């Protein structure tokens, strides 16, 4: 139940404001900046502020803070979801989210803001559907918004019927400084870019552990997805009844399902790093990277960030394979490797200087984060089985999909 959705800037100027209820004075935004400054300088800054009886719940964008005032006990989660939908719409309409578009796209921004939410209740958020009634370059609204299917416009015709899938893996690892891994979760993400003719009803089928157990095939390699979050197109009743994944894909690239399950297997990359930090004299970086992944897979663009001293200078890198660059902006040793064959082992021996005078305040120990991205490798073992493309007109679809394995929260706690 937001009161006024506004767009701020990095200096406190309200780039654009659009009140939906009028229950909050338009001059209350002037106190948001001083309140945020007071909160950030005392450690009490929060995305949801409070100006007397008025709360300012907002998120931080690339260059603007999407603040939305409210007064009653509105659903803060609803406000956050509306802000996220607005950010996604802005990203879909404008390729960049900066001040260069707020002062230049006011003609369409006001229309989008007016159409998106009325009286504090958003009603339309489909960027592909919204692109048919509000344009920056108007006919009656499409029947898709009034119709039940509000994510697939009817009458779409293409010369071919190509659906490209993207099974992107997310390897998140939380390795403590003692050498054990605490949080090792794998978050699957099936992102497809559908290009079909008509309103096809895709019937996705994978090698799910629950599906295999129900069929009676609970003995082969089946992914044990603890959490499966389907898109709005996926029918919840069909999935709940017998694990039937039936949904009409939209036109373009979108996130169909987002799997999330834990993993009890050894890490793909083992990072044995040591720190021979002499007191104000020098330091050594005995970093060893052991690839526990399969030797048949190659991790393209391996980037193991090694946080070196913030005041380190005159650095030297004695490594084995891969370029080693020290970035003073990020204050870390960027162990960049282009191609790392599975089972490979690269050894590096860093050595940098240190000022004689000690620092005034502590600097902390940022965790070492690898940036491995191994294509054509599914760690969870989930394999797509079938995709029932059904159309009333009748056509022969050509489904396609690729598996990409990358690093998620692949951090390693330092000593």
């Amino acid at each position: 139940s937001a009161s006024a959705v506004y767009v701020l800037d990095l200096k406190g100027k309200v780039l654009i404001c659009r009140n939906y209820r009028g229950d909050v004075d338009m001059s209350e935004v002037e106190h948001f900046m001083p309140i945020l400054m007071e909160k950030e300088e005392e450690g009490m800054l929060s995305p949801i502020l409070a100006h007397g009886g008025v709360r300012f719940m907002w998120i931080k964008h690339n260059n603007l803070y999407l603040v939305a005032t409210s007064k009653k006990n509105a659903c803060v989660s609803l406000v956050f979801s509306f802000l996220y939908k607005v950010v996604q719409v802005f990203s879909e309409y404008f390729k960049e989210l900066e001040e260069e578009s707020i002062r230049d796209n006011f003609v369409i921004i006001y229309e989008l803001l007016d159409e998106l939410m009325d009286f504090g209740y958003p009603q339309t958020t489909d960027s592909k559907i919204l692109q048919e009634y509000i344009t920056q370059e108007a006919p009656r609204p499409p029947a898709t918004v009034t119709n039940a299917v509000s994510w697939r416009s009817e009458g779409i015709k293409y010369r071919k019927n190509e659906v490209f899938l993207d099974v992107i893996e997310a390897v998140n690892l939380l390795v403590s400084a003692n050498g054990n891994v605490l949080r090792s979760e794998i978050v699957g993400s099936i992102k497809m870019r559908v290009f079909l003719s008509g309103m096809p009803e895709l019937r996705l089928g994978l090698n799910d552990k629950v599906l295999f157990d129900n069929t009676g095939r609970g003995k082969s390699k089946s992914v044990e997805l603890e959490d499966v979050k389907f898109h709005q197109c996926v029918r919840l009743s069909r999935f709940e009844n017998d694990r039937t994944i039936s949904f009409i894909p939209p036109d373009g690239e979108f996130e169909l399902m987002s799997y999330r399950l834990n993993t009890h297997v050894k890490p793909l990359i083992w990072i044995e790093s040591v720190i021979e930090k002499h007191s104000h004299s020098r330091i050594e970086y005995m970093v060893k990277a052991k690839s526990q992944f399969k030797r048949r897979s190659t991790a393209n663009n391996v980037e193991i960030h090694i946080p070196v001293p913030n005041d380190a200078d005159s650095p030297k890198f004695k490594t084995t394979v891969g370029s080693v660059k020290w970035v003073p902006e990020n204050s870390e040793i960027v162990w960049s490797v282009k191609s790392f064959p599975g089972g490979k082992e690269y050894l590096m021996r860093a050595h940098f200087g240190l000022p004689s005078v000690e620092a005034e305040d502590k600097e902390g120990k940022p965790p070492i984060s690898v940036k491995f991205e191994i294509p054509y490798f599914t760690t969870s073992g989930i394999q797509v089985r079938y995709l029932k493309i059904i159309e009333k007109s009748g056509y022969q679809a050509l489904p396609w999909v690729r598996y990409i394995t990358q690093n998620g929260d692949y951090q390693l706690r330092t000593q």
């Binding site: 899938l165 079938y386 995709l387 396609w400 990358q406």
Partner: peptide, 18 residues
């Protein structure tokens, strides 16, 4: 070609389960 693994064709349904 494409970085992250070559795209592969998918089936239509579980042909082995009718």
């Amino acid at each position: 070609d494409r970085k992250g693994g070559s795209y592969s064709q998918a089936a239509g349904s579980d042909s082995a389960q009718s």
